[PDB]
Amino acid sequence: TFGSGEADCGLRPLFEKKSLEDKTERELLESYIDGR
Amino acid sequence: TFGSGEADCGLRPLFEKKSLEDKTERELLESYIDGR
Amino acid sequence: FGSGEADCGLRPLFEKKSLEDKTERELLESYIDGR
Amino acid sequence: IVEGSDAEIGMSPWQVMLFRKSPQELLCGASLISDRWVLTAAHCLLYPPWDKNFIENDLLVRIGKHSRTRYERNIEKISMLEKIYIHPRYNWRENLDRDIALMKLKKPVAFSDYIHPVCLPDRETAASLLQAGYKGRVTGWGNLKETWTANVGKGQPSVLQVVNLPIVERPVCKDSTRIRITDNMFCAGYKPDEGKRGDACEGDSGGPFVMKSPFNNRWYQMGIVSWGEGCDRDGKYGFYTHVFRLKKWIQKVIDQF
Amino acid sequence: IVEGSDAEIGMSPWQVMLFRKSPQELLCGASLISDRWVLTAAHCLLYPPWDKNFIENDLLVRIGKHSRTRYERNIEKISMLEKIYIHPRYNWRENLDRDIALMKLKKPVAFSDYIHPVCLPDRETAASLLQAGYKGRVTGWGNLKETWTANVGKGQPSVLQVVNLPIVERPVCKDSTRIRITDNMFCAGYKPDEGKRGDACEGDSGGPFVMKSPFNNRWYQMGIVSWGEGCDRDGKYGFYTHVFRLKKWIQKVIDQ
Amino acid sequence: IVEGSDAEIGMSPWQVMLFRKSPQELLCGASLISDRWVLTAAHCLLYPPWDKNFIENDLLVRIGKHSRTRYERNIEKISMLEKIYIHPRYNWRENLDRDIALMKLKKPVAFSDYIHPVCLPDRETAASLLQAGYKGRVTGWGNLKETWTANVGKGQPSVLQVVNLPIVERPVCKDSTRIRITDNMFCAGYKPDEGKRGDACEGDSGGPFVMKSPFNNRWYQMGIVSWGEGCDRDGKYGFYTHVFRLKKWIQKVIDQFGE
Amino acid sequence: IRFGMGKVPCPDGEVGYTCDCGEKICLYGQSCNDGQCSGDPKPSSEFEEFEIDEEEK
Amino acid sequence: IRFGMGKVPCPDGEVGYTCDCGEKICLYGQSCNDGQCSGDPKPSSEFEEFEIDEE
Amino acid sequence: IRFGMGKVPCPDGEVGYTCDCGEKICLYGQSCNDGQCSGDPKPSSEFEEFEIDEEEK
């Protein structure tokens, strides 16, 4: 791929890479549909 | 004989050096260590 | 020679021993003060 | 952050603290967008009314912190700035429009479990996510209350604060302040009747308003804490700089010169 | 020094006087620590809100003095400074944190019966002497009274004043002043409930807070008169630069 | 000495006692200034009104004493006089002016913890210390008071007495008496306002009036007990011979008659 | 930056920048003097921005 | 230095140094306008010292 | 020598040396008749003092 270099951004090594869910996280996902 | 600099520091020539004690000196010493 | 006084004014029992006689300080205190 | 909560160790690896050398004090927050490029708000480096106008040699960058005050020895990294690029259209005069700035670290920061760059949104991840109702996360070590009371509590926080705010519909943003809005900005925060509350506050400026794309689980930076009226006021909403728009500039100056 | 008594001749040979050349005025107190190194509070040299930033040539140092005004002819020793060294992290904007500064003399003053260096503390002694209750000694030529615009007093003392004040437990210091306190500071003074009273005041700044170690009959400097609110006010205490904590820096500017 | 206290062993190692051979008696006090020279007040040796005219062969110089009577067996050394020199301008008439004399010893004394010389003022020391207010120390075995109750003995101390007195300003010494006061004399004693008091007295004459230099820790002799009116009298003051002024002469005789 | 609080104090008259007056915010030009301002701010515009000059790379 | 005696009064606004305002003492970063001291202190100092190192 | 205590009594008539009569000290050059001293104390030569001595240079 292109972009501007290395594609590893946005991946917390302490959460995403370890398949973990931080408390608040779940709330953001529910906001993408729920409401309407 | 060695050490470094003024080893005889804190010893006042007009009191300690001659075994004399200023009036209120005792007041200091008591607080540190008193009888009962 | 005889007269020399290289040690004049220095009491053996006091000045030479870092010991002051009872009233000695009273002179010092009459000096640096001015009242 | 007013109405937030202590963050989890490593839950925002791009949260950077813009630190002042002398006097020592917290200036603003920022976000690591690469191994040497940090993104912050312009007013944290330049804003005449408060006499703010700094130089690269008078600031410090503390990356990977958690405790607001403690020197986190083996965990944090403290770099010096090489050059500060402010947007040539920073309207601190009347709009606080294009309130954005980039700083280049003298040396690249080695990434770790506590330090990792956030992703800049693309023309479409932006479009799909930046929509009224979608919630974002704002982090920072800023004030806990607009004006805090001492003794039976403090005001400045101890450990990084996190809070989730919903992007608000444009018209309401406009109708909430006397300060003319622009396309380069967007607002977030709950509406009065919604019940839930929270908002960034002083000391949180320059902080990232990030969201998580359901498409790849990546953390994208949609906005930057810019300005607002008070802190957690019923009726006002915080205004964050529209990163996705100014992106054209950021990418340009990332090729530098 | 509020509520103090005239010091005995030579009962404080480390006491130094920071004298401004022109106009002639007493600025601060200080203490001899080595034959050429003097110690004083940083704010005696640099305090912006008062347009104070004394270059190493604006002052004069009169060592071994008892009378404030008179020129003790063949007793005192007036020395010039070569360079002023103020503490790096000196925070005069917030609470005078790290209010410490050193001054190097142009020439090492020969010691006499009236001029002698004080010993700096060491971990051991410092830990054994710095305790609430234990009394310390303050010395200086500063204001005898806060002198409010009505309270008719004599103001300036004629001879060096000395006062013994007890060290106060950290929390009480903390709880008395609205200013943030730090580990680089400690307060002393008499609690309202007690009978005795006394404190340092304007002009005594820089003066040494000394205690006598009953482990070797020597006087150790534990603090430097730094700041305070008013003078001898009921409940308020005076703050002193916690010398020992800065020993590393004091030593660093010299070392070998 | 009036209103004094007992001296400490060796606190005045220069104090010398002029003893008359026969009849045995304390004549005057004196001060050791070198190993073979004793400084004293001329009036002790010569005072026609009291038929006083002593020959060196009539006096004994007792050095290093403490007890006014006890023979300090191995403490005090006794020296005989070889020659006496009374200041040629000794004005025993009109005002006892230049009341000063020097006595040479037939054999040099061996100093000790009890036998030690006092320094003569140099110049700076003189100018610095001789001022209204500074105190000086007088020592002597003389009468304890002017007059007292008989019974015990009306006076006479058992051990060397000592008293510190302040130097009084010239106009005051001058107004305190009608005797023509010269520049070769000063006075010492407390003003009537100070509750503290004391003074030399009969038998202390010739004794030193020593001061201690802060500038160098050495004892210097500033005066010689000469005259006064009574002893410890309210308003009167005792006058001591201004040594430093006669210093020129002291040196002269010493240099030509010895070293 | 936070308005409403008073952290950005306003100069009496002229107001070279959008400041905080007594409490109501006074936009650039709208001269403040404690009791609100002229009501009419400005400058101002309604034409859509455009590019027609070289300055970048 | 001694506060409480109006020797170190500070001007109106963001008091850049601990000062004696009216009768009260204002802290760094706080503010006052004659009638009392209002505002929240900064702080400096609270921040644990450090020194950037490597080789 | 301590005056005042009658230790040095003046000879009836012109005292040739300073001395005490009743309780008053009659300066050299006066005559006292019991408890009273009258005269004009101005003796001890009228010619000022000078320096000479055999120190031939």
UniProtKB/Swiss-Prot annotation, chain C:
Residues forming coiled coils: none
Classification lineage: Eukaryota, Metazoa, Chordata, Craniata, Vertebrata
Domain of life: Eukaryota
Protein name from the UniProt record: Thrombin light chain
UniProtKB/Swiss-Prot annotation, chain D:
The protein, known as: Thrombin heavy chain
Residue span, Peptidase S1 domain: 1-255
Active site, per annotation: 43, 99, 205
Renumbered residue ranges of the record's region High affinity receptor-binding region which is also known as the TP508 peptide: 188-210
Mutagenesis or variant effect for residue 98 to W: In FA2D; Tokushima
Glycosylated residue positions: 53
Species the sequence originates in: Homo sapiens (Human)
Cystine pairings recorded for this chain: 28-44, 173-187, 201-231
